[PDB]
Design a binder for this molecule. Structure first.
Ligand code: HEC
Ligand code: HEC
Ligand code: HEM
Ligand code: HEM
Ligand code: HEM
Ligand code: HEM
Lengths: 49, 73, 378, 55, 49, 238, 378, 238, 75
């Protein structure tokens, strides 16, 4: 009973169902000049192109 | 109210106390528990039950009074 | 010497849970202290995890709790644990009070006063937690009881405009009620420690009323495993409630977004407030009805000051015992009449039941006590 | 059976705790299989595994 | 972007000196950057995930 | 007319304490809602990611999510164009505003169908009797802006009974009567009210077995430790 | 005889507050414990008002704080009071710790351990509370310290993806931090009661270090009015900072909406971390850096187990007192170097400052205690 | 790049007890409403925050009712614009922030609520930033960025507005560069801290209370400690 | 701790006077200021030398920081 309690409460603190939805984006390249970085949103984190 | 040592002053008493492993887990459950619970039930019938049958009679009376008021109109 | 008798925390542990001389006469009706404590810490845990996924705002609360019950893992059962554990806590609280009134343990005066203040605090925590899900029932009941607090002449209007944060139940009222329901069980636990302090000053009580100082068995390991038995009984009843019939207690209208215009016709508080509410609507006076409720709790204060018997308990006073069982039936009567729509025979029997409540506890207790008194050559 | 069991697994505390943790994992596995088999057995038909087995 | 010693990437949180492709040579930075699951298409596009 | 008609409890496949839900009927009912009833009723708290391993498949979830386009965010200009959406999609509102639906009717807003089984006095059988029991007024019509329905508090609804002999005549055999579509929509609304039904029954079975395990054991241990004071006896020595 | 000596509440209040045997030769250094208690209840009160006006939602958090500061009456003074009272709480905290190491009251071992646990809980409380305004600096400092938690080999990945509340910082992170920033201060209060309980078990300590059983004066009313003096000066400082310099200690980058893509080069947190972040960014080792931080506070744990002198005061051990002042200057040097950006001379002197930190603590102070033990023919 | 630390100026509100000129606040609001409220926003100040500070009743109501609202539902429920009585915020000249970045040459113009308080320096930074348009000494200047050394990187995508379009104050002050710049920086200081007058009032309160009350409690503590400071010891053995 | 079972002290006579009758501040400007001057004489040898080292390291690090920030090379 105790280890199932621990399992269910860790699963409650684990994640959320909507967070597991993450996308596969399409990015255009040559609108960025020669020698420049730019970030795009993937999982909230920056995506360096 | 305090701890042991100072509570009462009693002479003339010997208590016998049996080991837990000495005796059974369930010493005569069915031959004793059923007449004891029958005695404890009979000791509270006319004290506990007559409020609840008053509850059920007032329940049915007020219920059927509501039904009779709401079925002529 | 002995590690338990040397370390200062372990001295507190020894005086609390090991060397407590307990009465050997107490049946399962004395397990309620451990039951209420384990209910309290489970309420702490469930509300804590809810607060880790709750949003206190009028726009976002309903959708966020929906997100909990549909998206956050096991949040549906944690919410069901919190609500039904509040209901189980109420059952154990009423039966703790019933033990304390039946077995004559209410002669403990200041312990009874601490319990009354604890009853105030649990009522307030319960009501504001019930306000929190932003339901239709919660919105209208909060409006009604806020106007009940505005019944006070010349002080109540400023006090209600002080607790609003607006004109009505708006975002300020929602967040303030979140703060108070979010903070109060710690204060409840502190006054519970005070309750325990005055009891361990006095000492616990047996069914007879005769002090069992010649027959003191320890608190450990007997009452520890007996409280474990009662606690796991509470576990199985509570968890079977949250996993088989979640809807035997919860209102259907509780799952609706708050409409500021509707007032659905079966508007009611929850069943643990309906006996508080049946006294209200069966008395045609606003201030009179709320004063009647406050005087019902003050009657619960008064009843230690009217024990004009010569025994302690009603265990050997059967007339007062039968009056007590009539009061039990009258309490369930008032609760069911609180659970009915406003109807004319229901109005008549609710008024008769409330005046019967007052006449039994106020008047009939010293009358029954003095018949029992003068009957026994006293 | 009983004398053997008491003479082995009930005189050292840590060995007792270790063997009840090991038996607890084994009983957890056996109870998983039993409970899943029973609950899938009394509600055969309208379960997602067979509808996925269609496809 | 366009900072640090090697001209490429440069973290300001602890001064990690990366190259143009983000490879550490001065600092307590333990590892180098991770290639995501991206694939180019010669319409100047890329599918990233 | 202040005399409600209470729905009886019906013999469903989710009736008992060990009973379950038909996910194939959930599939049928969601096809019913998406193909009929989504145009008038919002169900905004249900997403396509709730429809992955319940009854549907993975790629057909992408097919359903690309069947409904709602919106993408700012394309560096805030143009807010139409996007298919792969798995994060929710279900679109038929009306952007409440008064949009009010002007599309005589007021009388169609509620969100997330919680309707658990939201009225009477659950899924209230829904079944509501969708079923349509007849004619004997003597009582009120203003001819509403319809007639006995299963209603107030006994008049603005919703036309949307059944009328095969509104869909859908995918498998399953002849689209009133009864088949009503059973499927009641099963689907029960699942929309509780996303965690059969998991709850599985944990209930686990818990009944564990409480049948513990209650001999813990009561035996309590009887065992209290067995000393149950056995003591007294004797008088002056 | 006495209500104070028979009533069970006033027994504890009398034996803790009124008739407590305290020594008599005490300067302003023993006011700091009462000042920590006053800051505790004051910060709890300001946080209570804030929670009655705050929403933990990442879309509306910054605007809700702006609503507090502008729209809500005196919410600006309560926000400034909570922030600067936390700052003065850290001031009184480090003064209390410096006193406990300087006069040599660290021989009371369990008191010291309870204090260390209180130090951990207060630091985590203050960090999550600083995350809660949901600004740029709060977001990115939470990101860096979350990845510092993820620096653990083979164990840290599951734990930090578990406490992420997502794949990164989102609304769930904000709600979890709000729940812990609420729930830890009452745990701090209860453990402070246990702290004071062990101290009343032992008895307080004079400046001289000589055992002072022979000069027992009661805490009432002498040290009560001395604590009133200290309380009025501390309220003077707090009112001064909230009425003339709010923007002095308040960091600028906590005043914008948290852009998740900006990352300004200003990276330093509020001043009560910069002693330790300088210890982090000195050693060129990830696990070595976080290990050095944990080992720094564990050296603060195992300070009494390196004591070997034959007198507990530093007032009569002069060269050890000089080393103590060098340690104070070393701590302030570490704090100001943490309050800097990173270039090459800063890297050099930060590494050298960490080396001097552990060289002075782990070597020079016990060897100094050895040599001034050795000088007196001992 | 380098970073110039701005000077500190002898402002008439720099003193710790000196207030702000409400006339300067009114004319600085006139500055903001003329030219500054076209690219930047100040979305955290309503018009009711101006009615007791820099205008009268009908003035602030006119300033709040000359502005669109685009209020919510009507009988159909869609939208309608409105003057708006007092609850109006400033009407956000760039709706989407990425559309703001696409409006000018990138580097979207931020809001102006906390800029005096949160730019590594007070209103002196803002004043020197506004007047610091000057000559480039042979630098990069990538076609959209302007040279100003009161900025980290010295490259700003904001044109100098300050000599252009003298705005005709309602009082009629002849607009130079530095006078109108000082007035708008004072208005921004008020926009940072609307509490400034009242916090200096309570500062005056607390300073008088702690200038008269602090020796009282100190003297009382010495009065009660007067015994132990004066006790004297003596040694009798037999 | 208790109060009554702490030690055993003989030979002690203590004189003390009522706090009303002596004044509030007896020679605060005649004894306390030479007292704190005595404290200032008795402290700076133990307290002062770290802070001047810290001030020197402060100014040296600041100036080396600026002179490393500005190069002016040769080309
Ligand atoms: C457009 C016409 C439709 C369609 C195709 C359906 N419904 Fe119904 N519905 C509609 C309106 C305008 C109203 C409002 C009147 C009222 O609420 O009394 C309703 C009402 C409902 C309700 C509410 C009844 C109650 O809560 O007691 C339900 C549960 C409901 N509608 C369900 C429903 C279902 C399941 C449908 C698919 C078969 C359906 N409606 C079709 C308008 C319309
Ligand atoms: C549109 C053109 C305007 C107008 C009418 C004003 N500002 Fe300015 N501003 C503008 C941009 C595009 C930027 C950002 C460019 C960059 O990031 O370099 C700014 C910036 C500022 C700043 C911050 C300094 C900076 O970020 O470089 C301040 C301060 C500022 N702007 C003030 C300001 C004031 C007071 C104005 C009224 C006269 C004003 N701006 C007008 C674009 C525009
Ligand atoms: C707030 C919830 C409460 C908690 C947590 C609580 C807790 C406890 C505990 C732990 C005990 C000792 C064990 C027991 O006999 O139950 C106890 C006993 C008691 N409580 Fe409470 N109590 C609560 C409410 C009340 C109330 C409302 C009253 C009535 C005023 C009350 C009156 C008593 C009395 C009289 C006893 C002693 C009974 C005896 O000696 O057998 N309690 N309570
Ligand atoms: C300090 C600890 C507690 C916290 C943080 C807490 C938090 C919450 C929150 C956030 C809610 C709203 C979410 C929901 O309704 O499911 C809630 C509801 C509620 N709480 Fe608590 N709670 C606490 C203690 C208690 C206690 C001790 C009780 C009484 C036993 C209680 C009774 C309730 C009730 C009845 C509701 C309404 C349940 C519902 O309608 O769903 N709570 N609580
Ligand atoms: C969490 C905040 C803390 C509070 C509220 C607190 C509270 C107190 C109080 C009320 C006292 C008695 C009055 C006084 O001497 O100032 C005290 C004394 C003491 N505390 Fe703490 N304390 C805290 C943190 C710490 C820490 C971190 C330590 C170090 C481990 C510590 C060690 C001590 C010691 C050694 C004494 C006795 C000092 C002496 O007799 O001279 N305390 N504390
Ligand atoms: C349980 C009681 C407490 C509550 C309900 C509480 C609530 C809050 C809230 C809502 C905030 C965010 C609003 C703001 O930043 O002004 C906050 C921030 C903060 N709290 Fe608390 N707090 C509590 C206790 C404490 C304690 C004990 C401390 C430490 C002394 C503390 C230190 C802080 C700090 C440093 C901030 C950040 C201030 C800022 O950045 O503006 N809080 N608290």
């Amino acid at each position: 009973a105790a280890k199932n309690v621990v399992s269910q409460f860790v699963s409650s603190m684990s994640a959320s169902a909507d967070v597991l939805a993450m996308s596969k984006i399409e990015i255009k390249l040559s609108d960025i000049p020669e020698g420049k970085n730019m970030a795009f949103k993937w999982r909230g984190k920056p995506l360096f192109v | 109210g305090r701890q042991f040592g100072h509570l009462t002053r009693v002479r003339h008493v010997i208590t016998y106390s049996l080991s837990p492993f000495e005796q059974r887990a369930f010493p005569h459950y069915f031959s004793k528990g059923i007449p004891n619970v029958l005695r404890r039930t009979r000791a509270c019938i006319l004290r506990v039950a007559p409020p609840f049958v008053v509850f059920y009679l007032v329940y049915t009376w007020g219920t059927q009074e509501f039904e009779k008021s709401k079925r002529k109109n | 010497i002995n590690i338990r008798k040397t370390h200062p925390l372990m001295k507190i542990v020894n005086n609390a849970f090991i060397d407590l001389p307990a009465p050997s006469n107490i049946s399962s009706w004395w397990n309620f202290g451990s039951l209420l404590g384990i209910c309290l810490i489970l309420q702490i845990l469930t509300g804590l995890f809810l607060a880790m996924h709750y949003t206190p705002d009028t726009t976002t609360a309903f959708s966020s709790v929906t997100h909990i019950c549909r998206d956050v893992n096991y949040g549906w059962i944690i919410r069901y644990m919190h609500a039904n554990g509040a209901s189980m806590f109420f059952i154990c609280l009423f039966m703790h009070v019933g033990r304390g009134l039946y077995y004559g343990s209410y002669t403990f005066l200041e312990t009874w006063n601490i319990g009354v203040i604890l009853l105030f605090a649990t009522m307030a925590t319960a009501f504001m937690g019930y306000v929190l899900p932003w339901g239709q029932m919660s919105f209208w009941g909060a409006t009604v009881i806020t106007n009940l607090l505005s019944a006070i002449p010349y002080i109540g209007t400023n006090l209600v405009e002080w607790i609003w944060g607006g004109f009505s139940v708006d975002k300020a009222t929602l967040t303030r009620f979140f703060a108070f329901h979010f903070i109060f069980p710690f204060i409840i636990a502190a006054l519970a420690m005070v309750h325990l302090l005055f009891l361990h000053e006095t000492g616990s009580n047996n069914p007879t009323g005769i002090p069992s100082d010649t027959d003191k068995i320890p608190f450990h390991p007997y009452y520890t495993i007996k409280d474990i038995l009662g606690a796991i009984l509470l576990i199985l009843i509570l968890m079977l409630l949250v996993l088989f019939t979640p809807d035997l207690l919860g209102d259907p209208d509780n799952y609706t977004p708050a409409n500021p215009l509707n007032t659905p016709p079966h508007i009611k508080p929850e069943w643990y407030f309906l006996f508080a509410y049946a006294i209200l609507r069966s008395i045609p006076n606003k201030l009179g009805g709320v004063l009647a409720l406050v005087l019902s709790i003050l009657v619960l204060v008064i009843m230690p000051l009217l024990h004009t018997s010569k025994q302690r308990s009603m265990m050997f006073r059967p007339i007062s015992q039968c009056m007590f069982w009539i009061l039990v039936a009258d309490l369930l009567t008032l609760t069911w009449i609180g659970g009915q729509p406003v109807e004319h025979p229901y109005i008549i029997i609710g008024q008769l039941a409330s005046i019967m409540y007052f006449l039994i506890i106020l008047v009939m207790m010293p009358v029954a006590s003095i018949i029992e008194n003068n009957l026994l050559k006293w | 059976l009983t004398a053997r069991l008491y003479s082995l697994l009930f005189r050292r505390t840590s060995t007792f705790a270790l063997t009840i943790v090991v038996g607890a994992l084994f009983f957890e596995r056996a109870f998983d299989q039993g409970a899943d088999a029973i609950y899938e057995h009394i509600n055969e038909g309208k379960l997602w595994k067979h509808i996925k087995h269609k496809y | 972007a366009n900072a640090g010693d090697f001209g490429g990437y440069y973290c300001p949180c602890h001064g990690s000196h990366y190259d143009a492709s983000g490879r550490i040579r001065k600092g307590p930075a333990p590892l180098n950057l991770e290639v995501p699951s991206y694939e180019f298409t010669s319409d100047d596009m890329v599918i990233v995930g | 007319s202040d005399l409600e008609l209470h729905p009886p409890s019906y013999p469903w496949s989710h009736r008992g304490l060990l009973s379950s839900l038909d996910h194939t009927s959930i599939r049928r009912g969601f096809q019913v809602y998406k193909q009929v009833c989504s145009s008038c009723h919002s169900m905004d708290y249900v997403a396509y990611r709730h429809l992955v391993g319940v009854c549907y498949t993975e790629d057909e979830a992408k097919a359903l999510a690309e069947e409904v386009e709602v919106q993408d965010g700012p394309n560096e200009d805030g143009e807010m164009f139409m996007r298919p959406g792969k798995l994060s999609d929710y279900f679109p509102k038929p009306y952007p505003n409440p008064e949009a639906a009010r002007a599309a009717n005589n007021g009388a807003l169609p509620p969100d169908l997330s919680y309707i089984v658990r939201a009225r006095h009477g659950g899924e059988d209230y829904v079944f009797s509501l969708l079923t029991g349509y007849c004619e007024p004997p003597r009582v019509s009120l203003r001819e802006g509403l319809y007639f329905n006995p299963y209603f508090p107030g006994q008049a609804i603005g919703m036309a009974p949307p059944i009328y002999n095969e509104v869909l005549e859908f995918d498998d055999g399953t002849p689209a009567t009133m009864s088949q579509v009503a059973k499927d929509v009641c099963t689907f609304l029960r699942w929309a009210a509780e996303p965690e039904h059969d998991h709850r029954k599985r944990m209930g079975l686990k818990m009944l077995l564990m409480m049948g395990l513990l209650l001999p054991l813990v009561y035996a241990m309590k009887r065992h430790k209290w067995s000393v004071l149950k056995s003591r006896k007294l004797a008088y020595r002056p």
